[PDB]
């Protein structure tokens, strides 16, 4: 099973063929770190970690599974809130902050007991957004509910129809108003393949 | 920019072929059975600092 964080924290803090062979898989650990960066509406994220006995390499070992209409609704709420923020309020952050001579910051002394700031969350009016209010900004929403998610591996989902109405209403900014495929006429993949095979250019199409 | 992004999409649609059948692939399951690796639960920022200092 798992292990407390203080041990691996001491591992990384106090610090060769067993040390040499584990260093081969470094960009794989970089990929597993980069594919699980937390969302703007999350404050903290707790993930599992595989690590070597001497702290040679540290892995993430988690696939970022999300439910698709919930994910689109959450990013549409982000879009609305950031439009709201630029029409209301800009100072860009100064890039690379940590200078070339100082080491990276220690987590046990500076970030560990400091409470983070307020994240990006919409108001979520309790009259209309009532079926979505208790789970909209969770890490993995509705995970421990047997009605909606099949289990802990978080693979299959089924929802109710007012919930789908609410998630379609909140995601209205990211979705087009199309109703049929009488749109995309001579602007679809088969016409693009025909223009590829005949070496011509559709007006607005690619070359 | 629209026309070039649509060019990349048409190229990815045309060059698509079905993937070849193979055995299911699990790197971390073979890493877990090794006694040289341990599992824990950490914050994202702490492991993000650990990965970059190990790379340094």
């Amino acid at each position: 099973e798992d292990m407390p964080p203080e041990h691996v924290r001491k591992i990384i803090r106090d610090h060769k063929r067993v040390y040499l062979g584990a260093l081969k898989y470094m960009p794989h650990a970089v990929l597993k770190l980069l594919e699980n960066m937390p969302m703007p509406w999350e404050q903290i994220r707790d993930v599992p970690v595989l690590y070597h006995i001497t702290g040679a390499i540290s892995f993430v070992n988690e696939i970022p599974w999300v439910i698709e209409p919930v994910y689109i609704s959450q990013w549409g709420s982000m879009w609305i809130m950031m439009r709201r923020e630029k029409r209301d309020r800009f100072k860009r952050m100064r890039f690379p902050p940590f200078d070339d001579e100082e080491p990276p910051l220690d987590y046990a002394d500076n970030i560990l007991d400091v409470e983070p700031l307020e994240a990006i969350q919409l108001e979520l009016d309790p009259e209309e957004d009532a079926p979505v209010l208790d789970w909209f900004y969770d890490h993995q929403p509705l995970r421990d509910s047997r009605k909606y998610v099949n289990g802990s591996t978080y693979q299959r989902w089924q929802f109710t129809l007012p919930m789908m109405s609410t998630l379609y209403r909140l995601a209205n900014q990211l979705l087009t108003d199309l109703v049929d495929d009488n749109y995309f006429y001579l602007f679809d993949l088969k016409a693009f393949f025909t223009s590829k095979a005949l070496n011509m250019a559709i007006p607005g199409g690619p070359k | 920019s629209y026309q070039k992004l649509l060019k990349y999409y048409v190229l990815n649609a045309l060059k698509h072929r079905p993937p070849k059948a193979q055995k299911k692939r699990y790197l971390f399951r073979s890493f877990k059975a090794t006694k040289f690796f341990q599992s824990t639960k950490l914050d994202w920022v702490e492991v993000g600092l650990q990965v970059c200092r190990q790379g340094y």
Binding site: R17, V18, G21 | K23
Partner: peptide
């Protein structure tokens, strides 16, 4: 000697996914 044998066994196990088709 043991650690290199363990990582070589894991390399052979990662090579097992395509072993009978590639060689």
């Amino acid at each position: 000697e043991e650690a290199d044998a363990i990582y070589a066994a894991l390399d052979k196990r990662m090579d097992e996914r395509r072993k009978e088709r590639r060689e």
